[PDB]
Amino acid sequence: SPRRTPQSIPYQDLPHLVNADGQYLFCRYWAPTGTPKALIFVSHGAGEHSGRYEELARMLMGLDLLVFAHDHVGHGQSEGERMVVSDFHVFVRDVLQHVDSMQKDYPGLPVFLLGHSMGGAIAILTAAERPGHFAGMVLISPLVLANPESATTFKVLAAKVLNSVLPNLSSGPIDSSVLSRNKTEVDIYNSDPLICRAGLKVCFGIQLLNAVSRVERALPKLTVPFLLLQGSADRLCDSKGAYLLMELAKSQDKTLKIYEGAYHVLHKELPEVTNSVFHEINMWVSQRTA
Numbered sequence: 001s002p003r004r005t006p007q008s009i010p011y012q013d014l015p016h017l018v019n020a021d022g023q024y025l026f027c028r029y030w031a032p033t034g035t036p037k038a039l040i041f042v043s044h045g046a047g048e049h050s051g052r053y054e055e056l057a058r059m060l061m062g063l064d065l066l067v068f069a070h071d072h073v074g075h076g077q078s079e080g081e082r083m084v085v086s087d088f089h090v091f092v093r094d095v096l097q098h099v100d101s102m103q104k105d106y107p108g109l110p111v112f113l114l115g116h117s118m119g120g121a122i123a124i125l126t127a128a129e130r131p132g133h134f135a136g137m138v139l140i141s142p143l144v145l146a147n148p149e150s151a152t153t154f155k156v157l158a159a160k161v162l163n164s165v166l167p168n169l170s171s172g173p174i175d176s177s178v179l180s181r182n183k184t185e186v187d188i189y190n191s192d193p194l195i196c197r198a199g200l201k202v203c204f205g206i207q208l209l210n211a212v213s214r215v216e217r218a219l220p221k222l223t224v225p226f227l228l229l230q231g232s233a234d235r236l237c238d239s240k241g242a243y244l245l246m247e248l249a250k251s252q253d254k255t256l257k258i259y260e261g262a263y264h265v266l267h268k269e270l271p272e273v274t275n276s277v278f279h280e281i282n283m284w285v286s287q288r289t290a
């Protein structure tokens, strides 16, 4: 019987890739009508999926880039227990497999990464694993340092799971009101059935703590060009992390844009913020492609 997504659609009817663990990942592609100037992989964050990047991907495709993405394991239309990962490196390995596959089909093209939140931590670790390979990285509120109050609370709960056998332990869900000041976007997020809005399992939170530790060790090795966009009122990824990334990365081409008063999800924020985010990404990638 055909292998199906967690929503029961056969993978033979969808673009897909099988990872090193034999798990099917659902894929998306947005290719221009002509010869692409560059490739760009979009890395989504925790709980969400690649379908949330439709508008950004169509803008990037309008710049003649071939945009590609997949749903990370345990997310969206990919296989895996929801919001579970054996080790955070699985996400990085799977991005690298997909980038390597695309570079075979489109050789000689520059490749960029774009990531938001947990997806931004994945993009940083992917670029750190392959120094000099990526042309540039666009980071939207990347997970570099978690909110101090939330991290201390979770680190206590993590000690309970690390010292004892407690497989079902979960913390509370990611509060939707702190995601964006745009209420319509929050309402849409709360209505998408492919988004997992359940409480974070302690085993998954432990992997996000591993991502933060690994990002910290990767910064003095990071040399890829990057554009970093961060809101000053982010309650999920503390803005101190964006300043730390600007300070500690060795990249010769690094830029930070702060959005005063904005919340976490800058590409789904108030129209003035979202319009600026799209324009800034468009300028930055346009200047670095030809």
Ligand SMILES: O=C(N1[C]C2([C][C]([C]C3=C4[C]=[C][C]=[N+]4[B](F)(F)N4[C]=[C][C]=C34)[C]2)[C]1)N1[C]C2([C][C](N3[C]=NC([C]4[C][C]4)=N3)[C]2)[C]1
Residues within 6 Å of the ligand: 044, 045, 046, 047, 048, 052, 116, 117, 118, 119, 143, 146, 147, 150, 151, 154, 155, 171, 173, 174, 179, 180, 185, 186, 189, 200, 204, 205, 206, 208, 209, 212, 236, 237, 264, 265, 268
């Ligand atoms: O990747 C992330 N996640 C990673 C994230 C930061 C983490 C902080 C944290 C940590 C860190 C270590 C350990 N922890 B933890 F587990 F203790 N923890 C608990 C709560 C936060 C937190 C949790 C947020 N997101 C959330 C989204 C944005 C959402 N969206 C998509 N469309 C929209 C529209 C409405 C605007 N919103 C999906 C991508």
